[PDB]
Amino acid sequence: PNDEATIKALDNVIKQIEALSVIVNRSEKADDAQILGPNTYKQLLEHLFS
């Protein structure tokens, strides 16, 4: 056996495992709530007589 291929294979598999073990899962999504604004009731036309 060529002892220099085993070392390279071990290094490669160790690098793969180390790379796979650093990935993090973090999400910073917003919320579905809607910001509300001010409003004023409007007046419908009316007629007054006595």
């Binding site: 070392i7 071990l10 290094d11 160790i14 180390e18 073990s21 650093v22 990935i23 993090v24």
Partner: protein, 50 residues
């Protein structure tokens, strides 16, 4: 520090390590250190005898 008292401080000899961000276990970190250290240690005594 005084007569007949000799302190032998542990100085860092190897600085190779990979912290497991997934935090699955502690043996992975020790194995990473040991494997990466032995990779370099074996490359210095390839075809040599002390």
């Amino acid at each position: 520090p005084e007569e007949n008292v000799y302190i032998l401080l542990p100085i860092q000899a190897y600085t190779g390590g990979v912290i497991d961000r997934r935090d699955a276990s502690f043996s992975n970190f020790a194995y990473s250190i040991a494997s990466k250290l032995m990779m370099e240690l074996s490359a210095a005594t390839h075809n040599k005898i002390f």
